Paper text:
Filoviruses are unusual among mononegaviruses in that they encode an additional nucleocapsid component, [name]. The C-terminal domain of [name] ([name], amino acids 139–288) forms a conserved dimer of two globular, α-helical domains assembled by the extension of one α-helix from each protomer across the dimer interface to contact the adjacent protomer.
All of the EBOV NP peptides bind to [name] in an identical fashion. The NP-[name] interface is primarily hydrophobic. However, NP R612 participates in a salt bridge to [name] D202 and NP Y611 forms a hydrogen bond to [name] E197. The buried non-polar surface area calculated from the ITC experiments is 520 Å2, which is similar to the 620 Å2 of total buried surface area observed in the EBOV NP-[name] crystal structure.
Residue numbers in the entry:
A (entry chain B): 114 to 123, 140 to 265
B (entry chain A): 113 to 125, 140 to 265
The structure:
Amino acid sequence: TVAPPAPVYRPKITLLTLIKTAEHWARQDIRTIEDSKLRALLTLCAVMTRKFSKSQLSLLCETHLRREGLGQDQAEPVLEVYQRLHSDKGGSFEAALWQQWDRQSLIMFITAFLNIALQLPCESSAVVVSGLRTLV
Amino acid sequence: PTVAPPAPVYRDHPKITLLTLIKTAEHWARQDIRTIEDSKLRALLTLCAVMTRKFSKSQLSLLCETHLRREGLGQDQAEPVLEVYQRLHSDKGGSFEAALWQQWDRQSLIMFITAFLNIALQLPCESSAVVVSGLRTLV
């Protein structure tokens, strides 16, 4: 790999605002909220899923199952949602989820995600985690 | 046509979190890293690469331009700056990140890392008007 030459010297939705929004909504009862707020929460989950490394999605899936009491047979559909939100372009998969899932299924999934996302590490790589150790 | 998987079937009824990453960046943005040890500088390069990936691909242009403005760099310097951000954002197994460490001089790495840490926490991590308008009602 060849690096480029070094430089020659002659409401903002920031990472923190995203976390704060998730913390607030993880604490709320969204079972009765309006469709417009629920649609926005789906976007929040899609954006936040993309703040997890691709390799961390397996643990995210498994933590989701454990919190919800879901069986191991339910792992692939849950992992598929996370993987396809993570690789989503122009909200294509996110819109398919909104259109094809029942409201109750989306509320269950969004609540489970919001209540696990802030406690899980956003990186799974042993090299990244060991690399960052000296800085924390 | 995009087909979503079936919904889950209910039969009955220091960790590197995103907040830790932000707190680590906040702390190191305030430090003078001109004299720190190589092991801490190497770790800061990993912190920059990991954070870069917390920005959407489309937000990289604004990140590069904010970097150029803070540093007083000319517009002819935007492509190699954006190249760094684009290749850290798509990096696999730290391949591009290691090439930087190996090929750039210590001064260049210090300058780049300081500039990034001092701009990363103030920039939105999303550029899409659809995403930003979608999230508006929730903030």
